[PDB]
Every structure is written in C-alpha cells, then in structure tokens.
C-alpha cells in the first residue's frame, strides 16, 4: 500500500500523507488563539519550556514576517522555521516587485499555493504545520488568515489551533453569538490581549504565569511580540477584575 507513503489518491480519493501531516501539527502539544479588535489583531499561543537547560527567550512559535505581518505556527519547529523564512523572502520580493507591502491574505494564498504543490508533487513532502497570519491590512483592516498542509486557506473573525482547539473555538463562537459582532469592541490592544488570555483560560481551564504564554500584536504599520513583563502587566490587570 504505497498510496499511503506519497501524495497520490487512495481508492476512496484520500491523500493519507496530507492527513498524517495534519497529525504532525499537534506534535508540540501547544494551543494558539487569534482575535480581532477595532484597531488591532491579537494572536496568543502557549509557551511550554520543559527543559531547565533551555534559554527560554529562544523558544518561540510566533514570527515577525514583515513590519506589518506576524505569523504563529502549530507544528514542529524545523518545519515552522522553514515556512517562516519562505514567508519573509516572499513578502520582501512582493514589495520590491509591486511597490507596496504584501497584504496578509495574499501572503496566506501564496503560502497555501506552495503547500498545495507538495500535495500534488511526489518528491516534496507537505510541511507538518498550520500557519496563522495576522495584520491590520491598509485596505481590509484587522485580518486573520490560516493555512494547513492540504493547501486550504480562509479568513476568520477569530480562530484557534492545537490539540484542545474545539473547546476554544466553541468558547469564542458562544461569545460572538452573545456580542452579535465580528470583533472585540475595544479601543486599546492591551484589553484585546486581556480578552484573548481570559477566554483561553476559561476554555482550557488552566491558569498562566508570565512564562506560560506568548503574545503577538498587529497594529497599523507594525506587528510586535510582547516581553514576559508586558504579559505579566497584562496578567495583573485580569486578576484585579
């Protein structure tokens, strides 16, 4: 049964190598979450540093692709960094060729098209990663676009990825049923980050120290990651309410 080893169709019209690449996604046992404010797009991810010998500052699954685009990865770090370098190079070339900054959704479509090729070409394996792209696009505004090993991509009001994704997803669905809107009706990014952590705590049912989390924030004309003390400042604010 070599139809399970390479990206050709099984008798039931399935690509097992694509399906198994999806299972590689959860290998890190990390859950990620993205939401949109009025002015910003916040992405948060769990940070598990099990080894005491690791330098914790170098353990990261959030990447600054361009000045405006950030990307969090669900999957092994080798494949994660492979995707990040290509995304950076693609976003840099786009700007040189076309004279304006690559939109989040266009970079998503391009990275998805590359992922699609690996599902059709035999010599290339899919990357065992799901890529969540975030920005505040100068045309579309706060934007979340997500890619998978199948080469699928779509825009989101909010999204979650990882082993306990379904719990976070329904938690967010139930909030947006209640609020009746497409986003977090909040002025400051600081409170949208607080919302993201609050709704992750409720869905996962765990408490977080400053070193258990990782936060990216996209605003107009820059995407930046938060320090341990920026997150600690945020954790204190939630606790005092």
């Amino acid at each position: 049964g070599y139809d399970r080893h390479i990206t050709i169709f099984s008798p039931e019209g399935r690509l097992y190598q694509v399906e198994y690449a999806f299972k590689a996604t959860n290998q890190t046992n990390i859950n990620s979450l993205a939401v949109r404010g009025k002015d910003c797009t916040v992405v948060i991810s769990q940070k598990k540093v099990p080894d005491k010998l690791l330098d914790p500052t170098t353990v990261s699954y959030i990447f600054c692709i361009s000045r405006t685009i950030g990307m969090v990865v669900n999957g092994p770090i080798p494949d994660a960094r492979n995707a990040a370098l290509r995304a950076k190079a693609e976003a840099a070339e786009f700007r040189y060729k076309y004279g304006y900054d690559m939109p989040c959704d266009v970079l998503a479509k391009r990275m998805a098209n590359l992922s699609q090729i690996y599902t059709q070409r035999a010599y290339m394996r899919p990357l065992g990663v799901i890529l969540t792209f975030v920005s505040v696009d100068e045309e579309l505004g706060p934007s979340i676009y997500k890619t998978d090993p199948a080469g699928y991509y779509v825009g989101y009001k909010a999204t979650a990825t990882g082993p306990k994704q379904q719990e976070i997803t329904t938690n967010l669905e139930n909030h947006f049923k209640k609020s009746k809107i497409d986003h977090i009706n909040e002025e400051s990014w600081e409170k949208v980050v607080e919302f993201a952590i609050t709704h992750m705590i409720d869905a996962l049912g765990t408490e977080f120290s400053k070193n258990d989390l990782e936060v990216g924030v996209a605003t107009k004309d820059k995407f930046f990651t938060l320090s341990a003390e920026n997150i600690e400042e945020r954790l204190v604010a939630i606790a005092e309410q």
Binding site: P11, K109, N113, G151, K157, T159
Partner: protein
C-alpha cells in the same frame, strides 16, 4: 536531490482502468454539489458554500471565479487543486491567446487549454491527477452562450444543464424535468435555486449559496468610458442580497 520521479504515477491496470483518474473522480463524488444551467440569453453556475467553521468568513473563500470578463468557473472536489487551476487558467487566457490576438479566447478554447493542463497531470512524471471536475460557463461573439464540464482525465463535454459532486444523480434528474430550449436567464436562476435546495441540508440563504451569471454586458462594471466597442463584462457574481430577493418568490 532533484525530482527523481521522472516516471508516470498514473498507469493502466490489466482491466484497462486508469486507477488515479478513477480515484480522482471518487474525490469529486465526495465534493459538495455544484451545477450549471444554460438559458437562451445567459448561463447560471451555482454551488453551496460549505463553511469549515462558523468563525471562518466564507466571503474570503470564492468557489465561483472569473477567468475572463465573459467566462466564469465553479467546481466539485478539492478546493486547493481548483484554486491553482484558476490561477493557471487565467494566465493561459493571456499568454496563449490575448497577447497574440488582442482579444479574449472563446469559451471552448479556454476550456480546451484547461483540459490540456489536467491531461498532463495524468501522464507527466511524478504528479497525481487534479481532484476536481470544473463547470465553465461563458459567452463569445461567434458561439454565443455555452456551458462545459472538465473531468480529472481532461475530458470536456458541452451541457444544456448538469450538476457534479455529492447529490449530482438526483440534481441531474431534477434538471431534466425542468429544462426546455426556451428558458429565459431569470427562469434558469429560479431552477438553479430549486435544484440546489434538494442537496443543501442546513441554512439556505445568500450567505451559504454562491451564484454567478453569464448574461448582458455590464457597462457600470467596466470602470471607464470613452471606447464604444468596450461595453463591459458579461460575467457577474450575484450579491448575498440579490439571492435572498429571489428566495422569497421561490
């Protein structure tokens, strides 16, 4: 390194079947239902927008795509395979026709070029066939309106009306009862919505249905004036609001 797969991955079995093409059609069967109906003064192509999550924005995922100002495409099967076929289809309409003749290709020829791209994925080294069936609707001055189905094999057939995917068998039987050679475009849209409701289970509205027409020239959608011979695209995507207007008189 380098692509060592320089040999065919689709080969003839003793019985004469081409395994990977058969298995590709199986993937198309599993795919969500899409259909096309040809009226006298236009063509309609429709499909259900199967949402992956209620947090997803199904507007950002377009199943119905403009190829030329007078040609549109919809599919059943694997979305990613369709997306790259649309990119390749749009480019070949320019490189192998517009850049030579200074005008857009007629439907049958663009369809022919897409069929060639899908045929090569059947015979070339180290590739599986595309896991999609296309329905391409279009207009051109010398052939009028036309509707084509392109299969994973690279075979294409002209249709008066047809469906592909999940509930195609039932949909085709429904279309046979309702189709005549005197249907007006509005009568074809009405039948397209009726036929799709049978195969759709959940919500049936302008946000869960994607529907486009090939009809009259749209000067308002051209984006400029001053050239009398340029009169605008015949391809138009119906808005979420325009669908719900027709679902009341259903």
């Amino acid at each position: 390194m380098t692509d060592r797969y320089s040999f065919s991955l689709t080969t003839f079995s003793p019985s004469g079947k081409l395994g990977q093409i058969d298995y590709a059609l199986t993937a198309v069967k599993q795919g969500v239902t899409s259909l096309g109906i040809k009226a006298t003064n236009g063509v309609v192509i429709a499909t259900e927008k199967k949402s992956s999550s209620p947090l997803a924005m199904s507007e950002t995922l377009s199943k119905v795509s403009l190829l030329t100002p007078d040609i549109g495409a919809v599919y059943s099967g694997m979305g990613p395979d369709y997306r790259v076929l649309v990119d390749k289809s749009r480019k070949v309409a320019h490189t192998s026709y517009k850049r030579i003749y200074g005008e857009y290709p007629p439907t049958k020829l663009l369809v022919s070029e897409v069929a060639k791209i899908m045929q090569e994925a059947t015979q070339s080294g180290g590739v599986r066939p595309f896991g999609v069936s296309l329905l391409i609707a279009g207009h051109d001055e010398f052939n009028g309106f036309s509707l084509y189905q392109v299969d994973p094999s690279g075979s294409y057939f002209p249709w008066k009306a047809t469906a592909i995917g999940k509930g195609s068998v039932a949909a085709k039987t429904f279309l046979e009862k309702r189709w005549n050679d005197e249907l007006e475009l509005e009568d074809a849209i009405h039948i397209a919505l009726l036929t799709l409701k049978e195969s759709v289970e959940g919500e049936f509205n302008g946000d869960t249905i994607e529907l486009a027409i090939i009809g009259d020239e749209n000067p308002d959608l051209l984006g400029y004036t001053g050239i009398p011979t340029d009169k605008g695209p015949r391809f138009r995507k119906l808005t979420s609001q325009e669908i719900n207007d027709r679902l009341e008189a259903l």
